[PDB]
Design a protein around this ligand. Sequence first.
Ligand SMILES: [K+]
Ligand SMILES: [Mg+2]
Ligand SMILES: [Mg+2]
Ligand SMILES: [Mg+2]
Ligand SMILES: [Mg+2]
Ligand SMILES: [Mg+2]
Ligand SMILES: [Mg+2]
Ligand SMILES: [Mg+2]
Lengths: 50, 113, 176
Amino acid sequence: TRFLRRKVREGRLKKKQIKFEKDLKRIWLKAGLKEAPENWQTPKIYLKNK
Amino acid sequence: IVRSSVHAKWVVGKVIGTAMIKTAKVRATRLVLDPYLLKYFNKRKTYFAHDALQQCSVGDIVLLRALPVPRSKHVKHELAEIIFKVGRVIDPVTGKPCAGTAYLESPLSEPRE
Amino acid sequence: KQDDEPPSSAFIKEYKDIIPNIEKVDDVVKRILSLEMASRKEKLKIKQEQLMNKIVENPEDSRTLEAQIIALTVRIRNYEEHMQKHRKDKAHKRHLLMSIDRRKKLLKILRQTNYDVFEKTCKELGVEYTLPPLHFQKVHRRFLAKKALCIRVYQEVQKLKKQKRALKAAAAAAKK
RNA sequence: AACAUAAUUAAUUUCUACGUUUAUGGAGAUAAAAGCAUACUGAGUGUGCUUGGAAU
RNA sequence: ACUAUGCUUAGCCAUAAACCUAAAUAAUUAAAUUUAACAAAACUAUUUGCCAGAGAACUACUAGCCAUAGCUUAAAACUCAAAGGAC
RNA sequence: UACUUAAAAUUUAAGGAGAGGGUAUCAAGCACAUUAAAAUAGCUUAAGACACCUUGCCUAGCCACACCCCCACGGGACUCAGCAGUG
Ligand SMILES: [K+]
Ligand SMILES: [Mg+2]
Ligand SMILES: [Mg+2]
Ligand SMILES: [Mg+2]
Ligand SMILES: [Mg+2]
Ligand SMILES: [Mg+2]
Ligand SMILES: [Mg+2]
Ligand SMILES: [Mg+2]
């Protein structure tokens, strides 16, 4: 069932990225900023970047 | 000239940081008895102290005096004395410079320099 | 590099003080006993002796912390030259990193015992000493990215506060 | 949003109006020479290593 | 018979019964001490790591990682009165 | 209660020598600091921060709650967790 494991792995990592992105949005919104800091783009750290 | 409320009217500790302006972070240690083992261990506390002249360096033993009014949320002490300067200790018994368990200047001599 | 490198015409440390006394010595004999006909190990005994005189108050003693630190600075700079040619030598790469760690340990003990000697040793040997950090910081992609945003978010909030203070003060000044 | 009246005993009114958690294939019953790591196929073999095999 | 491969030069993988199955140090050889047995005579002090019945489980999930069947970290429900070691 | 001012009982607020449940597969928290010309880049944390979970404890007694909305201007499922009774 490895095919499913890769499918589960790629969908688990996508949720892991959304949780990372959402956690970053919570911080600046709580601080009182209405938009993310200028020139900031959340890094994609769980994708096939390497 | 009423004194502070805090119990620690006088605390000795080591200057573990000096990166704040005119303030020295000091780590004090006390002995606390373990009730199960009946042995004493070190419970350490951090004290912010007002260093007016910024005359403190990391690793030196200092004496703190409780301030009558808290200067800030965490600064409730001032630097009374530097008991031992880091690497520049002066033997209290003889008064001669020392570098560890040795005399940089012999106590027999009288340099008076 | 470093300010001083022994000349090729210099005698080895065994005969450094003996040949001068001898009345007349041939050019060939001086060349045989110079640093040109010696191993690299011999050239390092001359570098160390020069540093001991220029730093240590008593160059005769080699067991002091300042002397041990000088012995390790010569080795460290030697290993660095070795590793510049032997890029894949893993035994000497361990020797280089272990000597650096040994020097830091000795510099810590020197600072705690004789600060005056510590200051001269670092200035002369050109070694910067950084104090050990109280707390270890973990490092990974998620942490470095979140920690970067938090610093950026804070700075922006403080910049906005400064602008508001200037505008508020400017309005008050006009009213006055 | 927050003024003013009064005052030859003194008082009056004002003193505002997002995100985050829980929920609807695998492993377990009643019996009606070897090994470790790893690669390939299928336990067979390959490479290194261990004796918890053996060898006068 | 022949290939991946064993070789070389640049990158990655981080796994062995990676075990002398002995943590690292300073002791002592007497405590009338086989202090189970087999290994490797025994024992003391110090510091750290680790262990707390068995299967479920070198598993599930989480997190880190040039790895994407992997690697490291590592449970619960569950079920039993054993499991296990030396002779 | 006395004096027209001093002894108590009882509370409140700000604090800290030390002590104080669980999970580290909760490992980072993200303004949590100092200075006082308003600058500095600091503060807490494997000696367990932060997060989540459970729990009245300190027992001559003490704490918390008083239908719900942590509060109670307001709103709403609109009141016995006073005694005795009922579903
Ligand atoms: K309540
Ligand atoms: Mg081996
Ligand atoms: Mg071939
Ligand atoms: Mg888990
Ligand atoms: Mg009721
Ligand atoms: Mg209420
Ligand atoms: Mg009742
Ligand atoms: Mg009632």
